[PDB]
Amino acid sequence: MKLDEIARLAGVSRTTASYVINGKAKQYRVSDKTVEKVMAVVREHNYHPN
After folding, report:
1. Which residues 6+ apart lie within 8 Å of 16 measured at CB?
2. Residue 18: which residues within 8 A CB-CB, separation 6 or more?
3. CB 8 within 8 A of CB 47
4. Which end of the chain is more exposed for a tag (fewer CB within 10 A), N or C?
5. What value does the CA radius of gyration of the chain take, rounded to a whole number of Å?
6. DSSP assignments along 18-48, one per residue
7. Which residues of 28-50 are buried (b: 16+ CB within 10 A; e: fewer)?
8. Domains and their CATH numbers in the chain
9. Contact 20, 44 (CB under 8 A)
10. How far apart are CA 12 and CA 34, in angstroms?
11. Could you count the other beta carbons within 10 Å of the beta carbon of residue 5?
């Protein structure tokens, strides 16, 4: 469950997915569009920000 697979499984990039993993989406530029998109993967796999 690495960051790259979470990005492919969700549909973003190595760091864009990280935004969702770290809970910083709104800070960067994925306010909600990627939140449900990428969070659904981060939380379904239970991957934490590291």
Report:
1. 7, 28, 30, 34, 38
2. 3, 7, 49
3. no
4. C
5. 9
6. HHHHHT-TTTTT-TTHHIIIIIHHHHHHT--
7. eebeeebbebbbebbeeeebeee
8. 1-50 (1.10.260.40)
9. no
10. 8
11. 13
Structure tokens at 3: 């960051």
Q: Which two tokens stand for residue 26?
A: 């709104």
10: tokens are 């969700």
23 Rama class: left (phi>0) / alpha (psi -120 to 50) / beta: left
Report which residue type is found at 7: A
Structure tokens at 21: 């993993």
Residue 7, number of CB atoms within 10 A of its CB: 21
